[PDB]
């Protein structure tokens, strides 16, 4: 309604690039045969502008809408540990 | 429910511009435009209240108002949008004439609102007034609108008219309002407040008991007042205009 | 007239809540209970089941001016034991043996018409 | 200035030398005003953690906290004594250890986090965990016996059955004789999911010999032992090719056919029940 | 769109709300916070009506719901706040309203007594609200000024495809404890307008009518 308010709503919104939270997402496609390619997405943010949160989802090749399995982490040690986990349970996939 | 504590006054619109810069010298801050559409509804006289308790005036009758905000597109013509949205344009809002008419209200059927007669007693300084407030968020049904809710309850519209003016925040939760007012009928609209801008400063009291807040905030009116002298006079109103009871009509405008 | 209504004696009033329970200040573990709306029939038997705990120390009511239905109980337990814990056990037991009764009472009954 | 930074460290350096002398926190060689606090970050892994005193107004922080470890250090912050401290390590040891294990069940399992025991199971802190899977036999969940000590932990893992009955949880019944004692760090993933596959078929057996003892039949199991040590039949043994989908069962004759005495001398004592899945 | 549906017991048991909570408890995935609930009834002081016109009028007070009164006549609803974070920022801004309101209920019993008195009131507290899988149910015990009066069970769900489904295994439930005369109800006040609390306040009323 007033040019004032809308003014300040204009350039303030104009920060938020640098004012909104950082986010970054990785999609990780696995070439697989037997038309069963599993999908890893890794998302990363930071909630509190300083600690780190892993956003886990891993889709088996059976279904598109069938998670086989979604979780967060916190500590990156148990994000290898779970890494390590998933790219053995792969393995075993593509030896049975 | 709130205590109000009011002043009030009114100015010609020569002074108009002149007014505005003195109260940005003071206050800090610029006007900022708003709008509002009040409809008074009174209780149907097709039914006997008897309820009414004649021998101990348990209660007597009253008037619910009901408020809402219309976008600034019902009120700017095809010659005004050139110009911002800003307070210049209540300049050109001197003719009783305006884009909003009676179809476009009668096709838009909030706030819930009653009031009391100011309180008595020639040793009050500010006019303190009692109000009781509820909000109406939505509503569903084979009948859902505002006439056919009042008319529900038992109410019956009366009138209305549109409120178009200007707002000063200032400290202490001191609020100072520029209004002009159209009434408006199917016979046409009219501008009571015709060559000229009512002022109103007010403050709003959450609990009645406090009485040392309600002496900070009549010492901050007066304040104001003082400091607006030889310029404008703020005047207590008649208390006995300021009554909107149902068995006696007058309406202060 | 100043006689108040009957109907006082079995309705409570908006606000009010049926069981009131405080601390004692004198003896530990000790809880004084008001009850609303009841009389001797119902602390009597209250009092006399909890006086079959043995971790029960003490257990008295009384009903201080005949005008008013309210009553007032007291109750103290032993160390590690909750008065409330008492008070659920008596009212589980005064239950089970009521039910008990009524089925005892039925069968005579029905036995009793056999035999008219 | 001066006095009051001197007052300040000395404070801090006699808690810490009381925190030293209680023997919770080991010393740190490279900083004398950093303690170091011993926690299993994973089964085998075992890493110290930096605690650090404010100069200010002293208060108990980790470099780099967690939001469960930032709740225990703001738990720290208005402890009023040494046991009461000695309890919140005590507890902040155990529940990471449970928030572990918790998290790798759930990467991978249904947790209860409803159920409270009267009493705890018997097997130095005990926690017990109950887990279950949304296809198995009612009333059936998997059981484990969390025991915490001082430098070591173990897991007891059990199959039991428990029911709810005006508000309270009864054991309706528990088994000792299959009790799974496993240290904390060889358990991996994969060996959870092999217990996660085990489990099915060991609760098909204990329901099985639930209702044998509600027939009042007694029974054995031929566990995998049992088989290898060929102390069985030998045609019964055949066509068990290693499957876990076939279960062997020892029966009294007696007790199968609930006191038949006269039927004891034309078949033996001992029937085998081979069920194949 | 969620679905919700409501279901009264009127012949049930103090320990009722027990017995349905551990027959459940298989399924039983969470509990969360206790929830309240309120009922009046108004009624109309004038003799001067219409034959086609209702006397009474209904309010529904939900707690959880951010303290929300519904008020309900001749199935026509009306949606009404109390709180100050519920108010539309223009109607604070422009002026038509002073920032405190009050709730309806206080209006209807102080200044229109003349035209509404009430008539009863049934109130329920210390509701018990379980998440079980892709469901919330809430159970609470009912209170008027005589004494205990029955079992109420509200379900809620986001998914509607297999509402139906869930009905009927909750009613199933209920069968095995025997409490074999419930009253349900699943109705929708406006089959095109769809508002979720208004429909939930309208199958509450016509739950606990008689």
Not at chain 2, 110 to 124: E, F, T, V, Y
Not at chain 3, 9 to 23: R, V
Request: glycine share 4%.
């Amino acid at each position: 309604d007033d040019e004032n308010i809308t003014k300040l709503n204009k350039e303030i919104r104009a920060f938020d690039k640098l004012l909104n939270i950082p986010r970054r997402e990785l999609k990780i496609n696995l070439p697989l045969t037997e038309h069963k390619s599993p999908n890893l997405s890794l998302m990363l943010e930071s909630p509190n502008y300083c600690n780190a949160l892993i956003h886990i989802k891993f889709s088996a090749g059976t279904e598109a809408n069938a998670v086989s399995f979604d979780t967060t982490f916190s500590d990156f040690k148990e994000v290898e540990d779970f890494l390590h986990f998933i790219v053995a349970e792969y393995i075993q996939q593509k030896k049975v | 429910m709130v205590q109000q504590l009011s002043l009030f006054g009114s100015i010609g619109d020569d002074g108009y511009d002149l007014l505005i810069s003195t109260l940005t010298t003071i206050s800090g801050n610029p006007p900022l435009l708003y709008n509002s559409l009040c409809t008074v509804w009174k209780p149907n006289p097709s039914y006997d209240v008897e309820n009414v308790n004649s021998r101990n005036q348990l209660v007597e009758p009253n008037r619910i108002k009901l408020s809402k905000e219309v976008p600034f597109s019902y009120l700017i013509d095809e010659t005004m949008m050139d110009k911002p949205l800003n307070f210049r344009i209540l300049k050109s809002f001197t003719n009783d004439k305006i884009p909003l008419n009676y179809a476009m209200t009668r096709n838009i059927l909030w706030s819930l609102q009653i009031s009391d007669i100011p309180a008595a007693g020639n040793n009050r300084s500010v006019s303190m007034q009692t109000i009781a407030e509820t909000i109406i968020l939505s509503s569903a049904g084979k009948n859902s609108s505002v006439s056919s809710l009042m008319n529900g309850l038992g109410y019956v519209f009366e009138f209305q008219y549109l409120t178009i003016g200007v707002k000063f925040f200032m400290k202490h939760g001191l609020i100072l309002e520029l209004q002009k007012i159209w009434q408006i009928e199917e016979a046409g609209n009219s501008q009571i407040t015709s060559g000229g801008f009512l002022l109103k400063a007010y403050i709003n009291v959450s609990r009645g008991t406090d009485i040392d807040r309600i002496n900070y905030t009549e010492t901050a009116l007066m304040n104001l007042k003082k400091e607006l002298q030889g310029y404008i006079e703020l005047s207590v109103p008649d208390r006995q205009s300021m009554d909107s009871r149902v068995a006696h009509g007058n309406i202060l405008i | 007239m100043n006689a108040p209504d009957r109907f006082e004696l079995f309705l409570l009033g908006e606000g009010e809540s049926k069981l009131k329970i405080d601390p004692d200040t004198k003896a530990p573990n000790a809880v004084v209970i008001t009850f609303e709306k009841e009389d001797h029939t119902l602390g009597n038997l209250i009092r006399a089941e909890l006086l079959n705990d043995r971790k029960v120390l003490f257990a008295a009511y009384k009903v201080e001016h005949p005008f008013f239905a309210r009553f007032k109980l007291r109750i103290q337990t032993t160390e590690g034991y909750d008065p409330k814990d008492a008070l659920k056990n008596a009212c589980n037991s005064i239950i089970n043996k009521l039910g008990a009764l009524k089925t005892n009472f039925e069968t005579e009954w029905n036995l009793q018409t056999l035999a008219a | 200035e001066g006095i009051l930074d001197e007052i300040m460290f000395n404070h801090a350096r006699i808690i810490r030398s009381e925190l030293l002398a209680r023997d919770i926190f080991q010393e740190d060689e490279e900083n004398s005003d950093v303690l170091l606090f011993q926690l299993p970050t994973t089964c085998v892994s075992m890493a110290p953690i930096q605690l650090k005193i404010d100069l200010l107004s002293g208060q108990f922080y980790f470099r780099n906290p967690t939001p469960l470890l930032s709740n225990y250090a703001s738990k720290i912050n208005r402890a009023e004594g040494p046991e009461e401290l000695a309890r919140i390590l005590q507890q902040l040891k155990l529940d990471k250890i449970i928030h572990v294990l918790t998290t790798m069940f759930e990467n991978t399992w249904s947790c209860s986090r409803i159920i409270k025991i009267d009493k705890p199971i018997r097997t130095l802190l005990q926690r017990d965990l109950f887990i279950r899977l949304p296809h198995w036999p009612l009333n059936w969940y998997l059981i484990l016996s969390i025991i915490s000590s001082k430098t070591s932990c173990v897991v007891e893992k059990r199959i039991g059955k428990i029911v709810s009955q005006r508000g309270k949880w009864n054991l309706k019944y528990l088994d000792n004789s299959n009790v799974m004692t496993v240290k904390l760090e060889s358990i991996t993933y994969q060996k959870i999911m092999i217990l996660q596959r085990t489990i099915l078929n060991r609760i098909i057996n204990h329901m099985l010999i639930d209702s044998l003892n509600q027939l009042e039949i007694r029974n054995k199991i031929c566990s995998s032992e049992m088989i290898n040590e060929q102390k069985l039949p030998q045609y019964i043994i055949q066509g068990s090719n290693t499957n876990d989908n076939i279960s062997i069962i020892t029966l009294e004759l007696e007790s199968f056919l609930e006191g038949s005495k006269a039927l004891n001398s034309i078949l033996e004592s001992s029937m085998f029940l081979r069920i194949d899945y | 769109m969620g679905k919700s549906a409501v279901i009264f017991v009127e012949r049930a048991t103090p320990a009722t709300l027990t017995e349905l909570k551990d027959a459940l408890s298989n399924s039983i995935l969470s509990v969360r916070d206790p929830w309240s609930i309120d009922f009046r009834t108004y009624r109309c002081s004038i003799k001067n009506l219409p034959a086609d016109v209702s006397k009474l009028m209904y309010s529904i007070t939900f707690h959880h719901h951010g303290r929300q009164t519904v008020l309900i006549k001749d199935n026509s609803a009306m949606v009404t706040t109390a709180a100050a974070a519920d108010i539309p920022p223009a109607l604070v801004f422009n002026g038509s309203s002073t920032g405190v309101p009050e709730s309806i209920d206080t209006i209807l019993s102080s200044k229109l007594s003349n035209i509404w008195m009430q008539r009863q009131l049934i109130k329920g507290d210390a509701g018990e609200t379980l998440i079980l899988d892709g469901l919330t149910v809430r159970l609470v015990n009912l209170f008027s000024s005589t004494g205990f009066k029955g079992l109420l069970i509200e379900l809620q769900a986001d998914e509607a495809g297999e509402f139906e489904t869930k009905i009927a295994g909750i009613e199933g439930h209920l069968a095995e404890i025997r409490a074999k005369e419930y009253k349900t109800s699943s109705d929708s006040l406006g089959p095109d307008t769809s508002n979720e609390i208004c429909d939930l306040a309208y199958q509450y009323v016509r739950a606990l009518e008689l």
